[PDB]
Design a protein around this ligand. Structure first.
Ligand SMILES: CC(=O)N[C@@H]1[C@@H](O[C@@H]2OC(C(=O)O)=C[C@H](O)[C@H]2O)[C@@H](O)[C@@H](COS(=O)(=O)O)O[C@H]1O
Length: 722
């Protein structure tokens, strides 16, 4: 029956499909249409049309595997999209209409109904499938009777009767928050509209409002921009994605119901965009350190995942007004235009999203200016993101502590992310494809960049752990300078190391001390493991002399520097060792398959060439110290290292500090409360992390106590000399 409920469903259809906006003369839209035409064609030709069939699609036949239910229903949603698209060859097709109706009834009688119980993954029974069913019925509401709609959505009410919890029919339900809570809306708000149930709509929207509250503990968005999910996992880039992507779709509909959400409540979304998401986007790529186990999905590499966030932001801009709308448009526009590697349209899956992006990109009134430098210390999730606009590089520091899990391996995904938070670092430079094109299945998991580990064999069946210490954190001085430390102990408590980082505008110093090993395994720090481009080969220099790397590891004793020279200076990487160090390097082709790190992925062999740099630690009390200097040419790098000749202030078991004389900035990490005199100019007095700048006779102080997660009055931690 056509009423206010169907009106809302019409709006929903315009959002999840947007057939009303389709234009055959629009190349990008025609491309998506062609993709849907092909998917429906394949589904129609491979579907079982035999009496007493045991499945609809042979490749999604084992229904004890919950994933097969969602995949099946999604094929029907695709049919619904095309049967209602005037330009599709399947528009109002009698066979497709009957195929959707008959398939819904078949699955309802033999696979998914109220008399069934969760078998496999609860997510498919409560989120994946219900969403696919809601969308199918919404799109084809003019072909189904209200009784049929209520009949096919009864199963949804059986598995998801409570808008505040998931796994309600199990022996361990949980409180819905974040991304999951948003999906709760895409399940019950739409189901409510389809069933014309006001109580379901109102109660669900009320539950959804919890999402706008910032938290100071547990799962959710924090004031400092961090986002935690799954109890204690940094997750802005995966579950946070689902949250903004799904919520931006729902809001236009929710705001037109009899239960619209207060404007002041939704105000926090802008905080998420500017504080949480924006910093994690560099040249169109969403930083992997925020994506949890999703890094192990071949169809979701960094640039693809970023689009989930960007399309969400764009929709929010569209529903905003004035300056707010204008600036959000500019944010999306500059990020998209800075991405010369990935075509944003490859992940805009509805006509309205495509249309919005096209108008934005062609609107001269919307400014597209390169983003400025920034540095975000996401202490509540132990990650740090840095971006230098002058030189054009981004830097990500991935840590964990007693407050956070190191890596997530679940649902057979991310089987080898063991060391992705053991002080792993990311460098975002001119090669926008670096962490893409098969990086994850080919990178050697035992040598993640920046990590100090023993060479012990690790099991794919292992799961994450928290760190014994709470002494992990970042002290930020300004948009270009910060200092971080991690009181590191490895997975089996056989190795320790005081690892610290000194972000000094256009370079990052890496210092490690107190390196100890009680095992029979060899210990070493991976200085880098960089994925190469066959098109842009690097010329390697050691102590400014060209070196020829081989698949076989070569030792370079008394190394003062290593320089990776590209034809594009924006891809150059230099490493300056404060004190001559003994390192080893190799360049080799590494093969692997996505299935190796994610059971549900393809076993197809992938291969990439990597340049690995390592420093062995054969004695207790060992240390390492070097400066990473990106994006400068060879002559400039050589000049800079001479300027940094005496930049290392100290690197021992209680004090680590680097000084940038050009800036007049000091980075300092203290592991005890002894009085530390620095550069015969001032003293720092407390265990913690510091970033200090001298501006003649004045001193700006940034102190952070990572264990208590508090700063402190200047006189408690700093004292100028004389
Ligand atoms: C955040 C996350 O990893 N969520 C998991 C699901 O993944 C998301 O799926 C969708 C969607 O619209 O369904 C959008 C996102 O890009 C993607 O991250 C999914 O993996 C389900 C079920 O698993 S599966 O059978 O392995 O595919 O589990 C969620 O936790």
């Amino acid at each position: 029956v056509k009423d206010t409920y169907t009106d809302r469903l019409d709006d929903w259809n315009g959002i999840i499909a947007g057939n009303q906006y389709y234009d055959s003369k629009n190349d990008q839209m025609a491309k998506l249409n062609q993709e849907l035409e092909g998917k429906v064609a394949d589904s129609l030709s491979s579907i079982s049309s035999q009496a007493d069939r045991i499945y609809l699609w042979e490749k999604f036949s084992n229904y004890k595997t919950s994933a097969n239910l969602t995949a099946t229903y999604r094929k029907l949603e695709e049919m619904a999209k095309q049967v209602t698209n005037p330009s599709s060859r399947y528009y109002q097709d009698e066979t497709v209409v009957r195929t959707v109706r008959d398939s819904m009834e078949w699955m309802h009688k033999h696979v998914y109904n109220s008399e069934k119980s969760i078998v496999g993954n609860w997510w498919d029974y409560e989120i994946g499938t219900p969403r696919a069913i809601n969308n199918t019925l919404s799109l084809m509401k003019e072909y189904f009777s209200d009784e049929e709609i209520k009949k096919y959505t009864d199963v949804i009410e059986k598995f998801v009767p409570d808008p505040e919890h998931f796994r309600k029919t199990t022996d361990n339900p949980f409180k819905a928050l974040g991304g999951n809570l948003v999906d709760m809306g895409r399940v019950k708000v739409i189901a409510g509209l389809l069933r014309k149930d006001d109580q379901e709509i109102s109660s669900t929207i009320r539950s959804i409002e919890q999402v706008f509250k910032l938290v100071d503990q547990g799962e959710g968005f924090y004031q400092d921009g961090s986002y935690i999910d799954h109890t204690n996992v940094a997750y802005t880039g995966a579950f946070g994605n689902v949250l903004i992507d799904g919520l931006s779709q729902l809001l236009p509909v929710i705001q037109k119901t009899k239960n619209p959400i207060d404007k002041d409540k939704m105000q926090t979304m802008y905080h998420w965009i500017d504080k949480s998401f924006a910093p994690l986007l560099v040249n169109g790529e969403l930083m992997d350190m925020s994506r949890g186990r999703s890094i192990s999905r071949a169809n979701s590499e960094g640039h693809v995942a970023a689009v989930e966030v960007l399309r969400g932001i764009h929709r929010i801009a569209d529903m905003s007004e004035g300056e707010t709308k204008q600036r959000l448009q500019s944010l999306v526009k500059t990020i998209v235009q800075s991405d010369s590697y990935y075509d944003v349209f490859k992940n805009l899956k509805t006509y309205k999203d495509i249309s919005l992006m096209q108008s934005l990109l062609s609107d001269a009134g919307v400014a597209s200016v390169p983003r400025t430098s920034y540095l975000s210390a996401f202490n509540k999730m132990d990650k740090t993101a840095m971006y230098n606009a002058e030189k054009g590089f981004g830097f990500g520091l991935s840590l964990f502590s007693s407050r956070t899990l190191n890596y997530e391996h679940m649902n057979k995904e991310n089987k080898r992310g063991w060391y992705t938070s053991d002080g792993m670092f990311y460098l975002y430079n001119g090669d926008l494809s670096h962490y893409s094109d098969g990086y994850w299945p080919t990178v050697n998991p035992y040598k993640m960049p920046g990590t100090t580990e023993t060479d012990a064999k690790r099991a794919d069946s292992d799961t994450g752990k928290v760190l014994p210490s709470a002494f992990v954190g970042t002290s930020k001085l300004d948009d270009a300078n910060a200092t971080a430390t991690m009181d590191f102990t490895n997975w089996n408590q056989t190795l320790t190391a005081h690892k610290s980082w000194f972000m000094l505008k256009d370079k990052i110093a890496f210092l490690g001390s107190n390196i100890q090993n009680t095992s029979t395994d060899t210990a070493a720090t991976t200085i880098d493991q960089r994925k190469l481009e066959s098109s842009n080969p690097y010329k390697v220099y050691v102590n400014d002399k060209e070196a020829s790397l081989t698949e076989q590891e070569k030792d370079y004793p008394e190394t003062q520097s290593v320089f990776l020279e590209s034809s594009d200076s924006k891809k150059n990487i230099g490493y300056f060792f404060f004190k001559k160090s003994s390192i080893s390097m190799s360049k080799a082709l590494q093969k692997g398959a996505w299935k190796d790190i994610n059971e549900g992925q393809s076993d197809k062999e992938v291969e990439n060439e990597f340049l690995t740099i390592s420093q062995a630690h054969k004695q207790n009390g060992d240390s390492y110290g070097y400066m990473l200097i990106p994006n400068v040419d060879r002559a400039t790098f050589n000049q800079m290292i001479k300027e940094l000749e005496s930049s290392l202030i100290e690197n021992n078991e209680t004090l680590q500090s680097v000084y940038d004389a050009k800036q007049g900035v000091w980075g300092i990490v203290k592991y005890d409360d002894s009085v530390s005199t620095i550069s015969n100019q001032f003293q720092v007095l407390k265990r913690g992390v510091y970033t200090i700048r001298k501006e003649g006779d004045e001193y700006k102080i940034a102190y952070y106590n990572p264990e208590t997660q508090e700063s402190a009055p200047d006189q408690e931690v700093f004292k100028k000399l004389e």
